[PDB]
């Protein structure tokens, strides 16, 4: 099965109207190190909820 | 009398037919040959 | 004497595409499609110079009818009355007066009614 007519650039854009990405609503701030981080994830320096959970 | 002021006699230089050059010419498409048959073909026609 | 076609061919294609501005999709971008669209637009325009004279007369008649019936007479009797009264105002003007000078239009209706009586 294949198209009988070439779809338009307009129809291509309409299909892609649901493809846009969503930015992260907001980042969280660690209460001890002050780092920003994804909520419920550890920070880049290894803090979570104010505690040094892992080295490096 | 200069090389750019000489003209041929009126009626002495009729332009040739040019077939197959568009609707407006009157000889476009089939070029006066009509439709199909032996006489429309390249090299077509019966002998004397 | 070899002749390259590019400069003349480009001008011809551009002349058609310029006439196709505002058309949708390939009709304003693609020569093959734009050429057909420009031809069809020309055919319609020839046809509709004739249609325009029909549609406007039809509009004037409808407005004269409404204004005549506001004054108590149908369009067909109004026109016959004006012709019996030797009034030669045409429908374009009668429709203009019907909208912009209702007092003058009433006077024309009275003239038509008198010629019919």
């Amino acid at each position: 099965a294949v198209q009988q007519n070439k779809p338009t650039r307009s129809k291509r854009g309409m299909r892609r109207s649901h493809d846009a990405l969503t930015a992260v609503t907001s980042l969280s701030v660690d209460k001890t190190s002050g780092e920003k981080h994804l909520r419920h994830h550890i920070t880049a320096d290894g803090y979570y909820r104010g505690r040094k959970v892992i080295a490096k | 009398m200069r090389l750019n002021t000489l003209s041929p006699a009126e009626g002495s230089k009729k332009a040739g037919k040019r077939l197959g050059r568009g609707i407006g010419s009157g000889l476009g498409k089939t070029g006066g040959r009509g439709h199909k048959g032996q006489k429309s073909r390249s090299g077509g026609g019966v002998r004397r | 004497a070899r002749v390259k076609r590019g400069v003349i061919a480009r001008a011809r294609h551009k002349k058609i595409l310029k006439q196709a501005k505002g058309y949708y999709g390939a009709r304003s971008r693609v020569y093959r499609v734009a050429f057909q669209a420009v031809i069809k637009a020309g055919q319609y325009a020839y046809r509709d110079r004739r249609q325009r004279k029909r549609q406007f007369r039809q509009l004037w008649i409808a407005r004269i009818n409404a204004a005549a019936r506001q004054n108590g007479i149908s369009y067909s009797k109004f026109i016959n009355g004006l012709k019996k009264a030797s009034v030669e105002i045409d429908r374009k003007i009668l429709a203009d007066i019907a909208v912009f000078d209702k007092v003058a239009f009433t006077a024309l209706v009275e003239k038509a009614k008198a010629a019919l009586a």
Binding site: - | - | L59, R63, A66, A67, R69, Q70, A95, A98, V99, F100
Partner: protein, 142 residues
């Protein structure tokens, strides 16, 4: 000079109230359709709605001649295979009496967006009462 054209932002529309009691359905509908379109005004313009608002009272007392009360059938299809439905005039008056006049008028109005807009100016009621006293409708003897 060019011919006048009515302008949607300055057209004057008035309110009327009509009593359908005992009137012949189709001969009432033509007058309604005419006035909803604006064909009675010198400013009539085919692409502009210059018509009036019309309230129709007593829709369930509209009349029809001959044997139409029992023999006029209203058909419609639900879009489901085999879904052809029907109702007689009398069945329609009993269940949805405003529809009888609304259907008749809709058939005599232009088709398309403008004709649908003209139909919204028609307000049909079964009984003898309406809620549009604020619009001060004038009695219209159609």
């Amino acid at each position: 000079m060019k011919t006048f054209t009515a302008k949607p932002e300055t057209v004057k529309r008035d309110w009327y109230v009509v009593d359908a009691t005992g009137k012949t359905l189709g001969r009432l509908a033509t007058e309604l359709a005419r006035r909803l379109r604006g064909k009675h005004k010198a400013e009539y313009t085919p692409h502009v709605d210059t018509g009036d608002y019309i309230i129709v009272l007593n829709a369930d007392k509209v009349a029809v001649t001959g044997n139409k009360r029992t023999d006029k059938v209203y058909y419609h299809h639900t879009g489901h295979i085999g879904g052809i439905k029907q109702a007689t005039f009398e069945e329609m008056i009993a269940r949805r009496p405003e529809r009888v006049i609304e259907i008749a008028v809709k058939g005599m109005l232009p088709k398309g967006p403008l004709g649908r807009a003209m139909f919204r100016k028609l307000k049909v009621y079964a009984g003898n009462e309406h809620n549009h006293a604020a619009q001060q409708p004038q009695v219209l003897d159609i």
